[PDB]
């Protein structure tokens, strides 16, 4: 898929709850001194936008591919499809923003984990979580893709259950 | 360039068309000025 996604016959119809857009600005709270890196991504394997990515050093360049929490390099916050370039916030930096999830029913304050597809899921799935992820809001569906506001702050000392 | 202006003198057909459109626009503006509801 894509982020921008088209001519319309008519325009689409308060200030509240207007941020529920797939192409919304990922950082709920931004900050200067946040490190952002550029990498290449596979244009036919998996679309890394708003997903946890890992570094795959290929024979021609270092790419980023959707990955699990065990081998996560960071979070892909934006993509330039013209150059097929992914922008990554390293895991060493804090993040507070909207990410792609696969569970349409997640409550606030729950512990979360990133799966092999770079997707937010409930931490009770069984895999030992290695990152501190907490749900700051209930998951909402855009009609279909599920998004959720999360706070990610570093790695977890001892893997939980 | 408006046909409502007496001093206006068009040079070619293209300017004549521009004057007509300006004339129509001003009449619509004048209509809304004089309109009462």
């Amino acid at each position: 898929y894509s982020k921008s996604m088209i001519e319309n016959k008519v325009f689409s119809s308060c200030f509240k709850s207007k941020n529920e857009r797939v192409d919304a600005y990922s950082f709920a709270c931004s900050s200067y001194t946040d490190k952002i890196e550029e990498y290449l991504y596979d244009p036919a394997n998996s679309f890394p936008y708003k997903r946890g990515v890992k570094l795959v050093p290929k024979e021609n360049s270092i790419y980023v591919e959707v990955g699990a929490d065990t081998d996560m390099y960071g979070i892909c916050v934006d993509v330039c499809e013209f150059s097929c370039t992914a922008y990554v916030l390293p895991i060493t930096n804090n993040f507070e923003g909207y990410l792609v999830t696969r569970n349409p029913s997640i409550k606030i304050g729950e512990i979360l984990d990133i799966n092999n597809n770079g997707v937010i899921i409930k931490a009770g799935g069984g895999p030992p979580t290695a990152i501190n992820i907490y749900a700051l809001s209930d998951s909402f569906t855009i009609n279909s893709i599920n998004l959720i506001k999360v706070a990610i702050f570093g790695n977890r000392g001892l893997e939980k259950t | 360039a408006s046909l409502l202006d007496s001093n206006f003198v068009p040079i070619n057909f293209t300017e004549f068309v521009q004057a007509i459109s300006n004339t129509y626009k001003q009449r619509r503006i004048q209509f809304y000025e004089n309109l009462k509801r």
Binding site: C29, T33, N93, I108, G109, Y134, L136, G154, L158 | -
Partner: protein, 151 residues
């Protein structure tokens, strides 16, 4: 309180430039970089110079309070009483400064853990003590540490 505002009748003699910085009112850190990330958050209690955890629930936005362990989120290095807000250094950012110690047992070269009350106690590891615990007043002990994360 960070700055107990009390009126005095005589000036206090302050001329020596040594042993003047170890005080409960000295906010911030001993060494600070321009590229240090700072976040202000609503707080409860008084988590000044302590480890803070983020507590999530009329529904209100999440706040912070003194805590640690698996729930450790950051360090509160400064506080504003009027706005009831606390400046917090996230755990993903290293910090150097004086923090609250549980007791006087902490010494140099000691690995320290943030307890449930946000106080530093000897042994995951979070910080390495740099000096011995000093009693500012009553049971308040301050120790210089170099926070580096969680093990």
């Amino acid at each position: 309180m960070k700055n107990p505002q009390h009126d005095a009748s005589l000036l206090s003699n302050s001329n020596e430039f040594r042993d003047k910085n170890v005080e409960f009112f000295a906010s911030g850190g001993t060494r600070t970089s321009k590229f240090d990330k700072l976040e202000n958050h609503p707080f409860l209690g008084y988590p000044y110079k302590r480890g803070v955890k983020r507590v999530i629930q009329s529904h209100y936005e999440p706040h912070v309070e003194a805590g640690g362990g698996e729930d450790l989120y950051g360090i509160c290095i400064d506080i504003d009483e009027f706005s009831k807000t606390a400046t917090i250094v996230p755990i993903t950012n290293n910090f150097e400064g004086y923090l609250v110690a549980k007791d006087s047992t902490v010494k140099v070269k000691d690995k320290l853990i943030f307890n449930k009350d946000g106080a530093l106690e000897k042994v995951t590891i979070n910080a390495t003590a740099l000096t011995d615990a000093k009693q500012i007043s009553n049971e308040v002990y301050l120790v210089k540490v170099a926070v580096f994360g969680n093990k």
